[PDB]
Symmetry: D2
Subunit: 430 residues, 4 copies
């Protein structure tokens, strides 16, 4: 077993840090000046353009698909460094990556070639979105007996017709509310969009993913695709993840990602389990920024006393706790993404690892940021320090990407309850 | 022992809720359009005016002093109702109360009558402020052989001359930066400001409190009193607590609160100890608002499932923990204020109880808000719910009114280390 | 609102202290030498005798019923002082109090007069036991569609017949395994013990409670009431709460405590909810003993340094946290018992408050003992300090008297889910 | 970066498991019937014999030193497997390894060859102990201006004369109180023992380590080496770690490990930092036993309900939390041991990682056991389940091997406070 970073991982770190310091630090000057969530997102466009030019969107797609992704550990390193500086634009990159994932993961070369093409060109500012989340919630979307998804799809001739509402998926409406360059819309199949989900069919058997591009939208009536609103978020105030209504929205059958059923659900589940492990790196970036800011402060400030405040056991205790949280978190993230790249391990072992990772790292990042503030004291509460921003940004992570309480803990619980559950398979082999 | 409330305690609650609901709810529409801390503060002036008209500033002064305060438990009840709805203005009220406290606690009847008049008249928008905190910090203000307060006073003829900077004291610059109506300025006596505090003199013996009014500031040259800035706060975004510089600022001897030294230190400690005990009520208000919004949601929303989310054990576990924190918190606050009113108890005993209360209630309120957010899920993160506001507001509490880590725990530790420490004196007697 | 203690409350404290210091301190020298759980229990009989002589058993019974209980705050105060010194015998008193409660709470003066008699007497060593817990667990005893209690009673003639097993109930087999002087046996009504509980009927409507005495056991075959075993406990090593099998156990119909069904469930619920509130005083006692031993050590030992270890911010932080946990706990117990005594409040308001109390106090007392040990350091891990005993005894509280995970959180959760739940009714009332 | 285990790592695991299952599981029958700590330790001797026979003591010693230790990860794997079954004898193995460490780490090939020979032999039951801890504590042994270690040494002629007391060092008295085969005794140099440590000289500059064999003790007056007692511990009840008194105890100069001073301190510090990382594996084993017992239970028991208790979210939550603590803990131990092995890293970087590991894994192991107990509920509290043992055993870890509060957080704090502190140097490399 080894923890040593290769030259290309060190170089990926160097490159991510250089990009964040020279490009991302300037985003705040542009977006802070804007009035609402969409305008803040829009003032972020020149910085995503730079991200594209730095090869960062191409790095979200595997090499066999024409991208430059080196490995998931490389990716973990990048996100940490990005998020330790500025989640604006960084968020847009990872949300794009998530929106690409169902295409990346499907076993269909013609779809991949066609739909991933903008994202590997090194040009423009193409956006992708994985549109799963809804106004009514999604934690119980697979509950047998439940109403299931409320965005539904039905086949009419050689096309599918989308009826329903999405909320929260980042990037979904693109820069201009005319749509992301690629959207994967997760629907529950329903011949009659008025009828309740049959309580005798397993909901997983009814999942479809339909690909929607700016063209798919242009080919529909204006009112088939409506942006009803843009949430005003506590943190990550420069991301767009609007409220969208599909009314009789027409999609060619050839934009169906795969066969409806367990296979489509399986693509969603896999995309989101990967996000589950990677999200830890984002949480670590934010929590690390908080810890480093409080550490530097405690090593250089006496707070009107005779010694630097780090010399006070109660201050040191907080920073020790912060440090431990960060170190365990990063090890767990590298363990998780590594577990997910292991072809010899069954899916349930990977899924369990991914769930643990999202839960621990996101819960713990919050404590880390709050302990850092308590260490600094009153000064941390004002916006001449990073902490007010970090506080709001860190509370996103346990709630988003499938909240820990409703989704990730129940996904994990379900695995552990299975008769063939092997707790240590990812460590000691099966 | 008895927990029952009197008809007048119940009336204070009703009176406070009604004021909050009918008046304070309207403040957001006014302050939300202003684009800085001072402008947001100024936008709250009409609500503090209404607070005065409702007798709330008068209720901060005890009855023997011409005020209408019935007890500390009434006060706790009022603050909880107020902070449960809107800390805008509510914060101005308690900051005034703290500002008035050295005068209320001192025992010069004619000084009291003179300086408390505007606050018991039921007219205008009079502000008070206890100016203690400094740019360099104050956790070590009493550390022997340390720098001490960087705000310093010297006697010159019939007058005192203040040199130095304050930062954070709410209300200190008034509505218009010409000063609060009454500011109690905490100084370290020093004949030569350019020389360090004498390391062989106990810091507590050099403490003086000087009363500075709008007239005092008007009697000075323009560059003797200046606002250098106004912190942009994570939460409580409508309060004012600026960065003030005193340069050769002249104050009349008749404005000295009491003889410099231990009695002046004790006036400060007592004011901040009362505040330590009452601040729990503010924290309870904020956390209760979170808990109740979460509870209501959890009993009305299935999150696309077949039952209300309160029916899920993990969700209910969060609300349970929330409830418990709030209930233990309120009990401890009532215990604390009651202990402070008990004339048969030593200061040591009252102080320790006051410290415990500040520490517990303020730490636990944070957890209570965050757990409520986890229970509600993604929806808690958008500003059409109150949690973004509450998350920022609740984080003030462990940091302000003497941070838990640097000040409150150290004060409690010093009591516990005393040879004659009686841990249960407040319960079972001495 | 007032936190002042009356002369009688301070006298109950002094009295309770005097007893624990002069009597209970001597108990360890006897039970320490004993081979097993039962031997250790029997070895505490002389001390329970002294508790009866000090009127402590009589103080578990209300005054209207010939006992000397002044209030639930008095009771809280007493239990805290007792458990601070020694949970041995102290546990027996309180397991007797719980055993008496369904009788204390019933609507029948004649049942009360007959059955409470030896406990208000001031003589002998009478034991009571509320026999509810079973080998297979009880957290789901009221779940519709589940197997329910596996101790069952049928009516045959002028008698009820008990079939089944009990486990854990303290005092249940008395000093000699011929039974507690009084046992309230909580049964599921089943005409055929071999048939599974009907999934169509609310389990709560099938609850019956049957009073079983040493006489009842004597009037039965010797193999109709058997003690299968005695659990060896982590802490509270001197209690007895054996594994008891009822096979065709005959009980007179006049020993039926009340009408089976929602009324008998009410009695069990009410009894355990009062236990929920008062158990906190026991947890406080144990954790207070940990805090105080750690406080004294921290204020007197430098651990080979230049200053007493309380001067180290990290050590003080631990003591602070202990203090806070204890202070918030007591406040919560007093609020809960007073809430239980307030005749103006709906039952569910009282129940929620008792549930909170049990949950907070028992969880937090474990934290309090462990932080106390961390503060003392390595020394705390050796049996010349109290901590090894306290650690073991403290871990009982979150698990016994209805564990927090399975039972008390679920009871609380049910209340909160009700359409007319009033979170603050016990503080502010109502409508 | 790589997490995959090699064939020899997987074999090391299999071998440790086999030994734990077939040998160590039989240990309890023998020690349970003994009366006190020493007797329980002595009853353990034949299992330690079997451990030597299985190569496990030899595997505590690096290959270039004659041993068979393949790496610290191999070591970590072994310790977790052993401690997941039975810490009796297992603790004796690791206490010996600690005792061997200052010798293993010194730079003298002849001294190593001489003093390590018994331990690489494959025969007997040789014991080693690092005797550092003292009655008055050691958290402050390096505090300038403090009393310092109370066990002092001074040179008289061609020998050293030890005066004072040790407390806690496992194995220190050997099987029979005539001494461990090898004991490294840590002393503060002092010409007049009745005079206080000079407040002007750095305590670290005054540290010496003298090797004490059974022969050294044989060559002294009988009352020069006295065992004054044997602590009764809450857990790990089969270990011996006596109170020892040295009175004018003569040791040959050839038994001095190195010149007194910073180099001697450094060897003690490096020994205890290696232990600090590896103790995590011991904590993980104990807490893993607790988690697996609770998990198996949750998956096979409905607790009188209709579904296995793992289906209740609150139960699931506990098990999820235990699982996360264990996973994060093992990763951090492997990270930390691999950090200690990296020749390219500064010591401060290694030290900091080792302190983090000890603090986190040991605190978090206690939580894991407790949560597991809470999820099993009342059944976890009786000695027919593992938990009572597990609870007492797990509480040792935050306290021993340098307590978290007094020592490990202070060691970590000092490193963090240094001008040149690089937080991420073990991850991203130095600058
Ligand atoms: C910046 C940002 C970017 C995002 N990106 C995307 C994206 O690209 N695509 C996308 O689809 N979504 C996206 N999301 C949404 C995110 O994935 C959310 O996690 C998702 O909406 C699910 O939220 P939830 O876990 O709160 O579930 P909800 O269904 O909203 O449930 C809320 C709460 O109900 C309770 N609950 C409900 N059911 C249960 C149960 N069975 N058991 C226990 N508790 C239960 C839980 O306490 C839970 O927290 C984004 C959100 C943000 C803020
Ligand atoms: C809305 C608002 C209203 C306010 N009202 C007032 C007011 O009316 N009057 C007023 O004077 N101030 C006011 N303040 C400031 C408030 O009282 C702060 O608590 C005060 O500034 C002290 O800050 P601090 O506790 O962080 O101490 P600091 O001196 O700034 O120390 C900061 C941190 O350093 C560490 N530290 C320093 N010394 C030690 C030590 N010896 N031991 C251990 N750790 C140490 C601790 O981590 C501590 O948190 C207000 C602030 C706000 C935001
Ligand atoms: C010293 C001592 C004295 C005692 N005194 C008495 C007495 O006088 N009378 C008496 O009757 N008993 C007594 N007991 C037993 C005590 O009341 C226990 O609390 C009782 O057995 C119930 O235990 P439990 O809550 O662990 O439930 P169990 O049914 O054993 O459940 C065990 C675990 O399963 C899980 N679980 C089961 N169902 C659910 C669910 N629905 N939702 C979530 N989790 C679930 C929980 O994690 C729970 O902790 C005593 C025990 C001891 C050690
Ligand atoms: C099974 C077992 C095996 C052991 N093996 C060995 C061995 O092989 N060799 C050996 O030498 N010892 C051994 N020990 C002892 C063990 O290493 C202890 O950790 C050691 O005694 C130090 O204990 P301590 O950390 O509590 O220090 P102490 O000096 O006893 O301090 C105790 C407490 O005081 C407080 N404190 C003291 N100073 C400070 C400070 N400056 N700052 C903050 N807080 C402070 C802390 O709260 C601390 O926990 C063993 C013990 C056991 C039970
Ligand atoms: C790679 C992970 C990006 C996180 C996307 C947000 N979300 O899934 O809710
Ligand atoms: C009673 C009001 C307390 C508010 C004062 C805030 N502070 O002291 O920092
Ligand atoms: C009033 C004290 C309750 C005794 C505990 C018995 N039990 O319910 O498990
Ligand atoms: C790996 C060594 C642990 C055994 C002794 C621990 N200790 O130093 O106290």
């Amino acid at each position: 077993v080894d923890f040593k970073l290769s030259p290309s991982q060190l170089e990926a770190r160097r490159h991510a840090q250089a990009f964040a310091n020279t490009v991302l630090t300037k985003a705040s000057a542009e977006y802070s000046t804007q009035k609402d969530q969409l305008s803040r997102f829009q003032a972020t466009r020149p910085f995503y353009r730079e991200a594209v030019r730095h090869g960062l969107i191409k790095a979200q797609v595997p090499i066999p698909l024409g991208g430059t992704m080196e490995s998931l550990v490389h990716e973990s390193i990048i996100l940490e460094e990005l998020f330790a500086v500025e989640p604006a634009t960084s968020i847009t990159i990872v949300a794009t990556a998530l929106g690409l994932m169902p295409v990346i993961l499907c076993d269909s070369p013609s779809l991949q070639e066609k739909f991933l093409k903008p994202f590997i060109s090194g040009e423009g500012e193409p956006l992708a979105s994985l549109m799963h989340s809804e106004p009514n919630g999604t934690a119980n979307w697979l509950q047998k007996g439940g109403p299931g998804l409320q965005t539904t799809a039905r086949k009419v001739g050689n096309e599918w017709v989308i009826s329903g509402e999405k909320l929260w998926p980042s990037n979904s409406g693109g820069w201009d509310y005319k749509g992301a360059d690629l959207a994967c819309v997760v629907c529950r199949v329903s011949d009659d969009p008025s009828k309740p989900q049959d309580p005798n069919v397993d909901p997983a058997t009814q999942i479809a993913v339909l690909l929607v591009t700016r063209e798919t939208i242009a080919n529909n009536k204006k009112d088939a695709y409506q942006i009803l609103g843009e949430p005003e978020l506590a943190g990550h105030i420069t991301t767009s993840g609007p409220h969208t209504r599909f009314t009789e929205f027409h999609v060619p059958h050839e934009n169906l990602l795969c066969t409806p059923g367990l296979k489509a659900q399986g693509l969603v589940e896999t995309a989101f389990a990967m996000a589950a492990a990677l999200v830890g790196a984002m949480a670590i970036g934010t929590a690390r920024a908080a810890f480093e800011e409080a550490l530097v402060f405690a090593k250089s400030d006496t707070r009107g006393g005779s010694k630097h405040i780090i010399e006070h056991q109660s201050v040191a205790d907080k920073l020790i706790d912060c440090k431990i949280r960060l170190e365990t978190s990063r090890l767990l993230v590298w363990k998780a993404v590594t577990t997910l790249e292991d072809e010899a391990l069954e899916w349930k072992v990977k899924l369990e690892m991914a769930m643990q990772t999202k839960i621990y790292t996101t819960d713990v990042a919050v404590e880390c940021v709050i302990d850092a503030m308590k260490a600094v004291g009153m000064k941390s509460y004002a916006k001449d320090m990073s902490f007010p921003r970090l506080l709001n940004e860190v509370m996103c992570y346990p709630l988003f990407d499938g909240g820990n309480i409703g989704l990730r803990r129940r996904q994990m619980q379900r695995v552990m309850a299975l008769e063939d559950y092997e707790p240590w398979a990812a460590t000691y082999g099966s």
